[PDB]
Write a protein of this length. Structure first.
Length: 566
């Protein structure tokens, strides 16, 4: 991020300080939880709405010392009242704007929001799991403010969970009890807290919706796959992601050793000596080195993060992922709850800045071997079969005689999002009770209202709807402003939160009370459908055939000889 955007960010952080004080009221309230009482407070919004706010509710013991890299433990209860009028630290991470390590190991908290603590009827509960590649993110309201959602009569809960190597270190040796996925286990403990405590805030424990974007969508999907969460919630929404995405998991068991070596470890490649080393290290020191762990080959093979969700090397009581995601789909309890999935209309547009900085990436489309699904390719990417499959991908996305940045970004939309969605839909149809899945396509472009990911990506002035652009219309953030009610942006906020709230309530995203839906016939996708239908969300709401269908089928064709792997 440039100096100019850094200095502006800093000014916005100071302004958000002052705004937050002005919107804090003196109406404190006290709620009961299974571990003790919590004090929260009424806050106002810039639209002059109000909501009750509880931040910093612990759902697990701080994972420090001997608990580092381990499954979460339940928290210590308290006899008095805990002050929850203020946020806690985020998980240790690199700050996307400053580039400095920030956060704390003491990060296992959630926040609860609602416009009415004592409603006549218990309300739908929506739980947001934030994205950020499993390496950044938070539930702070300067990024994820509930100010738009609390216009609806819902309970909204935003959770945190361990990130990076501290959340996703994995070691083969069963004796060490570091199987991996600690951060996903964090999410599990949070969802258990929510089911067992949302009643205290007017929530219906029998009508919970989990949703998330990007890594939060992969997370929502993991929470729909694992037996650990069976029946804990009742709808799911996957926004630009799922667990089949190539970036959403990784067999990272050898990278603990690699990280240790980067941090100055001398010794053998041996799980116990490496763990004992990492257990001593300053948490900041490990997180700063994480961007250096992936090898050239791994990066070439499109492995996106060194640590992340993994198939656990051995089964334990708290095992979240005992098998690969595709195998887990075959028995998943979440296949049989109402589900909504969607993507934006130009997902890969996110990588505009990366392609300007490393223009030689475009030459990857000369053969496209690096984008062949890794289960079909070779690490070398030189096998004749890999070349043949790469030629198929190239036909799908290279439009002229010279591959272009636009072509690269289009390819990325499919590699990272549309193709794994198609794979998931087809696999799920074979293993479900018949509960509906609805598709949306977010296609609303504005720069009058933005969110911090646009700064992170240097995407100001870039026309089109990138990965993360829809979040602006769901959550307040410290770059936002009050929009006029007749503005296209305000209308889109009402539409997006209205649709999500409607789906959370009934399992059907359609509502006649949502402006622009008068002629919308939004049917769920059927197994028999050759072509997916979706609600395209622009200035108008229109049911259309997914424009991406043709390319989706071309990617599918790579599995013609290997249909069991599709």
């Amino acid at each position: 991020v440039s100096l100019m955007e850094k200095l502006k960010w800093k000014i916005k952080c100071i302004e958000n300080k002052f705004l937050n004080y002005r919107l804090t009221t003196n109406e404190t309230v006290v709620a009961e939880t299974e571990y003790g009482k919590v004090k929260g407070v009424k806050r106002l919004t810039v639209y002059d709405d109000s909501y009750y706010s509880f931040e910093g509710i612990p759902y697990a013991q701080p994972p420090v010392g001997e608990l580092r890299f381990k499954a979460p433990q339940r928290p210590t209860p308290w006899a008095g009242v805990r002050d929850c009028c203020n946020h806690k630290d985020k998980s240790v991470q690199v700050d996307f704007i400053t580039g400095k390590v920030c956060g704390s190991e003491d990060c296992l908290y959630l926040s609860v929001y609602t416009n009415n603590l004592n409603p006549e009827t218990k309300r739908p509960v929506l739980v947001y799991i934030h994205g950020g590649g499993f390496i950044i993110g938070e539930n702070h309201r300067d990024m994820y403010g509930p100010d738009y959602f609390i216009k609806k009569d819902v309970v909204l809960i935003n959770i945190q969970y361990r990130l990076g190597a501290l959340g996703f270190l994995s070691l083969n040796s069963e004796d060490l009890n570091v199987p991996g996925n600690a951060g996903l286990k964090d999410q599990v403990m949070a969802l258990r807290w929510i089911k067992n405590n949302c009643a205290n805030f007017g929530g219906n424990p029998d009508n919970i919706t989990v949703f998330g974007e990007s890594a939060g969508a992969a997370s929502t999907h993991y929470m729909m796959l694992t037996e650990q969460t069976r029946g804990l919630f009742h709808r799911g929404i996957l926004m630009s992601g799922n667990a089949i995405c190539p970036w959403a998991n990784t067999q990272c068991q050898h990278r603990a050793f690699t990280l240790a070596k980067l941090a100055g470890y001398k010794g053998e490649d041996n799980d116990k000596d490496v763990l004992e080393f990492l257990m001593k290290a300053k948490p900041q020191d490990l997180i700063k080195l994480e961007e250096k762990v992936l090898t050239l080959e791994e990066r070439t093979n499109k492995v996106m993060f060194p640590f992340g969700p993994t198939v656990e090397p051995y089964q334990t009581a708290d095992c979240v992922l005992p098998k690969h995601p595709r195998e887990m789909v075959k028995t998943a309890w979440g296949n049989s709850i109402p589900t909504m999935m969607g993507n934006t209309s130009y997902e890969g547009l996110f990588f505009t800045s990366i392609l300007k900085q490393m223009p030689l990436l475009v030459k990857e489309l000369e053969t496209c071997v690096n984008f062949v699904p890794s289960e079909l390719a070779d690490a070398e990417r030189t096998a004749p079969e890999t070349l043949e499959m790469g030629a198929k991908i190239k036909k799908a996305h290279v439009t002229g005689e010279t591959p272009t940045a636009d072509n690269f970004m289009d390819l990325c939309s499919h590699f990272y999002f549309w193709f794994p969605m198609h794979r998931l839909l087809q696999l799920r149809f074979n293993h479900t009770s018949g509960t509906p899945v609805y598709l949306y396509r977010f296609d609303f472009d504005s720069e009058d209202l933005i969110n911090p990911y646009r700064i992170m990506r240097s995407g100001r002035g870039v026309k089109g709807v990138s990965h993360t652009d829809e979040l602006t219309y769901f959550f307040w953030n410290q770059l936002a402003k009050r929009m006029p009610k007749e503005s296209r942006e305000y209308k889109t906020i009402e539409r997006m939160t209205g649709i999500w709230t409607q789906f959370a309530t009934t399992g059907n995203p359609y509502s006649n009370e949502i402006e622009g839906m008068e002629n919308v016939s939004w049917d769920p996708i059927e197994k028999s459908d050759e072509v997916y239908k979706c609600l395209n969300i622009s200035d108008e709401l229109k049911m259309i055939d997914v424009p991406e269908m043709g390319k989706i089928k071309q990617w599918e064709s790579m599995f013609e000889k290997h249909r069991d792997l599709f």
